[PDB]
Structures are given as structure tokens and as C-alpha cells.
Amino acid sequence: TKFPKFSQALAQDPATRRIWYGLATAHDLESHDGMTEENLYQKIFASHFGHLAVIFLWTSGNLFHVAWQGNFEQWVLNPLKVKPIAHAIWDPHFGQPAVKAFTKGGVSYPVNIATSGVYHWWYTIGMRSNTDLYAGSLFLLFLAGVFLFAGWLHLQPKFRPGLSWFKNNESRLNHHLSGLFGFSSLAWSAHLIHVAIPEARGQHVCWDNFTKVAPHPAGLQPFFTGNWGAYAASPDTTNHIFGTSEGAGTAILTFLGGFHPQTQALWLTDIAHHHLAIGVVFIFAGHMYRTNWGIGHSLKEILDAHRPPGGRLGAGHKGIFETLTNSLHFQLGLALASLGVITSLVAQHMYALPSYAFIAKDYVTQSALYTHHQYIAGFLMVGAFAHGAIFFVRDYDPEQNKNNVLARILDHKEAIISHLSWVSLFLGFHTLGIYVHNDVVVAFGTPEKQILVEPVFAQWIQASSGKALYGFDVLLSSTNSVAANASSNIWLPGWLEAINSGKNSLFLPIGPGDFLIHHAIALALHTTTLILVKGALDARGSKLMPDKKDFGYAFPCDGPGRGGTCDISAWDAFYLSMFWMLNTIGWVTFYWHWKHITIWQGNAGQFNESSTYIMGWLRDYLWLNSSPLINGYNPFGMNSLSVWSWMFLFGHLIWATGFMFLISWRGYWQELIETLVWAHERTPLANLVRWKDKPVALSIVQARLVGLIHFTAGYIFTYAAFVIASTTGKFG
Amino acid sequence: MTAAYLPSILVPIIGLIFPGLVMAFAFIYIEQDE
């Protein structure tokens, strides 16, 4: 009767619905009873300190468990042969064959092999022993304590910031661009120059000696002279053995392009010069806005003045400044969309341009990292559109936004929604038609009648970057060209060496299978965008519910009248787009993984011929690669893939259990539960025990959420077990 | 493993006693009128 202390409506519900709804609304502070704007911003500030502390405790735990139970020093000696260890296993349910099967890694106890890549990251940035991994874990424990204390401190009466502080856009932008982005990039350039690069060259540099060991022989003298190019002299030779002094140069800021020939990773001096230049650019960017000294820009003035004089944007951005500042959901939507694009860039650029030593020979780590960050990308993108819908319902005032870009968006929302509908159908009809074309015509024994379109546009982009594989001579590919001649003295030789070796993933060769899967990805993107945009733009109202904004973001329906109104809320458009996000990330990661396992085996022609029809995807990718995974245990024994083999089935179970919540709805279950209430009250020796909360069937929206969670969790667990075990079992 | 006794001490506690105690006290908290 008092658990939802933030909601008196839920704390007076006498059913089990009160517990579920109290748990599901806990972080939605804006809707809690008696919430002012002061208190909303101060609780968000403190819980941001608590989230940071959770992130630092997670990082310290990974460092500690690797320092304690890992084989980091043995892996450091021989990184292509040793398999990195994550943490040890202590499970009293294990049989002795299970204990033996998990005792890999060169150790004497059962253990998990790490797929996260933290070994390659920590090796590249300097860590060499277990004792500096342990030093880093104690530093993160200290930082976690500092940020827990700061979160508590800024909830104290004297240290609680005012709303005038929380809405200072110009001071926060100046500090986050020049200090949080720019200066910490400059400090990371310092770490690479002072620690990572010297230890990549055999010289230990730690806190005990870093003040008496110069990064460069000349040493901060070329910097204070303008002889900056003296810092690029003598780069690491192509004979350099990473971690040792043999073949090592003295440069710290050289730009060479391409990959270190032995680690197959970007040069550490390219990375150090990257972070120095990013640091300078971002520090300059962080002096744009006026804070206290009369120079700089007002964000309000810039937004107000950008109305095109032709009038095509209406009033332009007048009033956008206040709309964005007052709406935390608008800020969240912008942040999540930006973050989603970046974690997709991280996934794309980290497989094509790896920065960590000896990674990209860890096919399991490479596959898991790509899959991980694309799924994170899809979740962040769905969340950005969800919080834009919450913005329109809750925070958007049509009268402070008269004839804005926002109001004019809502003014032509049917043009937007119908053209997404057309492009989704246009993509879907023909992409599926060509796939089914090739399927049918290959089935009849005639693969030469397939419709195989060459992806000439992307091949021309690859050639513009210097790929000499398709005989297009435009731009960099030509020996003589202004583009090619301009970069010749700096990065162009190493970039052409990197892009014209078929031994990496830089601009992988593409064909008709890549054309067809790219169009399928485009269809999936435009359809997920359709569902989310339609949810955001119809959130305030539609023709079925012209007053939809009076009911909120998440409500079950408006009843069976007017034909029926199931899934009419904007929340239900989040719900429906979650399936399409899962589908698109499935198509993306299936494509990435099949193309890479065929390349890593040496059999790229298997992808090239089988990817153009759907039976090729079914038998040559799912069916062919399932066999090491589903044989992790069998009536003849078990091996170390037994856990993924169990997770695989586990994933199939949760996913299917989600169907029960998604197909069967409330009325059936409430009537069953009433027969169970009767039976408990009439059974002797059992009616001595009474519920405090009346058992009820789950709510309509809650059941949608539970089915979505079960579906999504089954999706993640099944694919994770497959992508890790099939790549492990094959090693290729 | 160094301090090898620690998993056999902490894993039963973290895996059984810790959830058993948070479930017991959460149950008390969610089922109290005041």
C-alpha cells in the first residue's frame, strides 16, 4: 500500500498490478506525484552520477577479473596463439567432463574465453603486466566512489543547482566541447605519446619514470620552434615487432596511413596525431558561445536568424531555442539519434580500420564486437524516435511554435508518412521479387537466368578511394589525378597498400549478393523509420483519436468502438518498430557475418554465388554453420561449446514464450485466474494462506511489453550463441 | 589461482543468500501498509 510512494494512484490499487506498474514507472520522474521542475532536474543530475559510477564499477570489474584470473601476461607474450581469458568458472552444478572441457587457456581451472577484445585494447594502450591492470581497477573503484559521493553531494541543500544552472546552454556547450571532448582527446594524445607508443617500442614508461623519460629524443624543443615535422621523422619500420625495440622508430606524430604490417592495425603514431588534431579542433569549437566575457554567440540569436527569406521554411527556427531547452525529451531524442549514428560508425569503422594490435585475427572478437555495437545502435535509434514521440505528446506547445519547422512538419505529416509508405513498398516489392526470382529460377536448374545487378555505384566509390579491383580509373585509382597527386606525400602510399591488399576488411569486394542485401537493408531502414515517424507524428492526434494527446503516451486503446482501436497509442508504434529494428539488425549482422566467415575461410565465392537467393542464406549460412553449435553436447560427450549450445536453445525458448504474450490477450487469462482464485479459497489447508494482493491478469500494455522483452531477449541470446559458437568452432 | 577459496565462499552467498535476503525484505517492503 506504499511501494509506489511516487504514485498514490498505484499505491491504492489492491491488485498485483500495483507491484508491476510501480516497478515499470519508477524512472519516469516527470509523472511522479508532486514533481516540480527543480526536483526533476536535480534527481536526474544525481542519478547521472550514479550511472557513471555503475560504468566505472563495470570497467574495474573487468580489469580486476582479468588481473586476478586471466592469462594476460601469457597472452601478451604470444597474442595470436593464446586465447584470452575473461574470468574463472565456479559452478557447483558442473560435472567433471564440464570442468575438464572448460579448462582451456593454459590454466588449471575452468574458465571463460573473452570475446570482448579487452586484451587487445589494453595491450595496444600500454598495459603489459597484471599489476597495472590491477592498478587500473583500483583507480576505477576510486573514481566510482568519487562519483557516488558527488551524486550524493549535489543532492544536499546547499549544493543543489538551480534551474538557471541546468539551462545554461552556452556554458555547458563551451565546457563539453573544449574540455570533455577536446581536452580529454588532447590528454589521450599525451597518453599515447608518453606511454602507449614507448611501450609499443619496448621501453617501459609508468608513473615511476614518466617525468624522466622523453617521448622524443629532441623533446618539446621542435614544438616550441615550429619545427613540428621533426616529430614525424623516422617512423616505425615495416620490420617492427610490436612490444619490442626491433625495427622501432622515433616518430610520435607521423601520418602514414594504412596498417602496421604485423599487427594489421593502425599505426599508434597516426592515432596519436589524430587525437592531437581532434583535440585542437574541439578546443577551438568550445570557444564559440558567449558565457561571461562578451565574446561568442548566443544560441537563441543564431536560431532566430536562420529563416530563409524565400519563406519555404515558414518562421524558420524562431522559438526552437525555448522548445529544445524546456523539453528533456527533445534533448534525449537528439542525443540518442546522434549516439545511434556513432555506435553504428564505431561498428563499421572498427572492423574496416582496426586500431588494436592483433585484433582482426580474433574472428570471434571481431564478430562479437560488430554484432554488439550494431544492436546497441538499433536500440539507441528506436529510443530517439520514442522520445521524440514523448516530446510531441508531453512537451510540445503548438502556440510557442507558430509556423516553425516543427509546426510545419506536423502540417505536412501525411505527405511524410505516405512517402515513407511508398518508398517502403517500392523497396519491398522489388527486393523481395528479385530474391524470389532468383530462388525460383535457381530451383529449376537455371542459375544463369538470375537477375544479378552489379553494385557499380559502391564499386565506383571504392575505386575513388584507390581500389584498383574494378578497373575504374576515376580519382585516386588513376596514377595521374589531382586527388591522387595531392595526397601522395602523406598518407596515399600506405592507404593504397592497405586498400589494395586482399588481406583485410578495408573496402571489401562487392557483387550482386551485396547489392541485394543493401536494398533489403534500405527496405528495413525505411520501414522502421515509417513506423517510428508515424508514431511520433500521430502521437498528438489522428482521425480515430483526434484527442490522443489527452490520454498520454502509453494507453491500451480507445475501446472497440469506431471499428476498434488496438495499438493506437504512440507507445504501440514503439512496440511495433521494435520488431523491425530486430529484423534489420538481423539482416545487417547476418550479412556481415556470412561475408566475413566465407572470406576468413578463403571461400568468398561461396558467399558470391549463394547470397543471391534465399536458400543460399538458409542452407549455406544458417544450416551449414549450425553444426558445431548444436554439437556442443550430444549423446557422445560435451565440449566447451556446450554453454553456447545451451544458450542457443535458451534463446529459442524465451523468444517463443514471447509469442504467448503477443498472440493471446487479457480476457482469456483473467477468466482462468478467476477460476484459480475460487479453487484456492475452496481448498482446505490451503485457504489458511491468503494473498495480500488480489491476483489479476497482466494489463494490455504490460503484456505487450513483456512479450516484447521475451521476444527481444530470445533474439539476442540465440544470435549471440550462434555468432560466437559458429565462429569459434570454425575458426574462419 | 591466488586466494582460490574466495569463489567457493562468495558464489553461494552472492547467488543464494543475497537474492534470498533481497526477496525477503523487498517482499516485506511491498506488502506493508505504512
Partner: peptide
């Protein structure tokens, strides 16, 4: 390698962090 005493130092600092997390959680809870 890591000594058990080093593990015990780590456990002390994590205990201090648990105490600070409880206090922050109580402050947020009001």
C-alpha cells in the same frame, strides 16, 4: 601475479563504494 592481500585491498575499496552507493540511493529515494 596478484597477492591475496591485494585482493583484500580491492574488497575494502569496493566496500567503501557500497557504503557510498547506499547513501546516494537513500538521498535519491528522499
Amino acid at each position: 601475479m596478484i597477492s591475496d592481500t591485494q585482493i583484500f585491498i580491492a574488497l575494502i575499496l569496493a566496500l567503501v563504494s557500497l557504503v557510498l552507493a547506499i547513501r546516494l540511493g537513500r538521498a535519491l529515494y528522499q
